[PDB]
Amino acid sequence: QAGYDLLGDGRPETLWLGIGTLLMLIGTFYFLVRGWGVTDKDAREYYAVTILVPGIASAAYLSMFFGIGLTEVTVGGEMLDIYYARYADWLFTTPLLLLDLALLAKVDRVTIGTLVGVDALMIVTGLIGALSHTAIARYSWWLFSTICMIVVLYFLATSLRSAAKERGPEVASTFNTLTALVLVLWTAYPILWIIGTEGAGVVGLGIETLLFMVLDVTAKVGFGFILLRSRAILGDTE
Ligand SMILES: *C\C=C(C)/C=C/C=C(C)/C=C/C1=C(C)CCCC1(C)C
Ligand SMILES: CCCCCCCCCCCCCCCC(=O)O
Ligand SMILES: CCCCCCCCCCCCCCCC(=O)O
Ligand SMILES: CCCCCCCCCCCCCCCC
Ligand SMILES: CCCCCCCCC
Ligand SMILES: [Ca+2]
Ligand SMILES: [Cl-]
Ligand SMILES: [Cl-]
Ligand SMILES: [Cl-]
Ligand SMILES: [Mg+2]
Ligand code: NA
């Protein structure tokens, strides 16, 4: 795989996991330090939610870097590497990102429950796809998981967007900027999975790990930088 076997254990993808670990850790500490001076009760909630996103991802990347939670899955005569920590990371961090958006839009708890429930289902069925032993099963789960993602993104772009507009231009402009980023960046994840080792196998584990790392840092640290710079986080939350 494209990369460099940093720990001398046969895994060139640790170069990218290590860089990912460091960027997530720096993002976490930067948010933490800037949050210590925040006193507004609403801004403190956004900070609390948002620091945990790269913070949890830091733990997951450190675990992958050291090889904890790595195993192999046999599909016919090939053996695919599966890092479990990647899916546990996304299981926790994607609801937290969705919670940031839902706080900005100020939508009700049943809407939030639907959004995070479909999101959880997306991650779980992706994991089932990653562990499945026939190509037909792996592509079928991927398709179902992708449908779940489309549902989540549809709700953001319609119901939450409409709610956010009623909160005024600072909230609506921040919501719209973050949602523009999410609609593009989250969609990149199923594309990479199906062209990478889990799917068609055009891209190998090295390039795949590099690109997931770039997506992850952007989706977590980049997202948080745009959010936490905005005056919208001072507005009332429920
Ligand atoms: C770490 C932060 C984020 C926003 C991670 C997002 C991950 C996804 C949107 C993954 C989606 C998948 C789909 C829709 C299909 C099955 C395979 C995936 C789990 C990669
Ligand atoms: C390589 C980048 C590809 C990006 C493709 C982005 C397509 C996102 C589609 C998600 C569903 C959008 C739901 C409706 C959105 C809207 O009403 O504007
Ligand atoms: C360590 C982060 C690397 C990846 C970061 C990708 C996203 C760039 C973040 C800088 C955004 C610049 C300031 C906010 C811009 C805006 O409001 O849209
Ligand atoms: C002989 C090993 C040298 C390997 C050099 C790695 C490529 C340069 C590092 C660039 C990593 C950029 C990551 C993107 C950050 C979002
Ligand atoms: C031959 C295996 C079929 C895989 C199960 C179907 C998954 C339903 C979405
Ligand atoms: Ca306030
Ligand atoms: Cl403040
Ligand atoms: Cl206050
Ligand atoms: Cl590769
Ligand atoms: Mg309130
Ligand atoms: Na290594």
Numbering used by the authors: 7 to 244
Q: What do the paper's sentences say?
A:
Here we report two room-temperature AR3 structures: the first, by SSX, is the dark-adapted state of the protein; the second, by time-resolved SFX, is the 110 ns photocycle intermediate. AR3 microcrystals in LCP (5–10 µm) were taken to SACLA and time-resolved SFX data were collected as described in Section 2.4. The LCP thread with a high density of microcrystals was continuously ejected from the high-viscosity sample injector and a femtosecond pump–probe experiment was performed with a time delay of 110 ns. With a crystal hit rate of up to 31%, a full data set was obtained within 2.5 h using only ∼60 µl of crystal-laden LCP. A total of 11 912 frames were successfully indexed in the space group P212121 and the high quality of the diffraction data was supported by the figures of merit R split and CC1/2 of 16.1 and 99.2%, respectively. The AR3110 ns final structure was refined to 1.7 Å resolution with an R work and R free of 18.12 and 19.64%, respectively. The resulting electron-density maps revealed the presence of 61 water molecules and lipid fragments. The mean B-factor value of 36.0 Å2 is also within the values reported for a room-temperature structure of 1.7 Å.
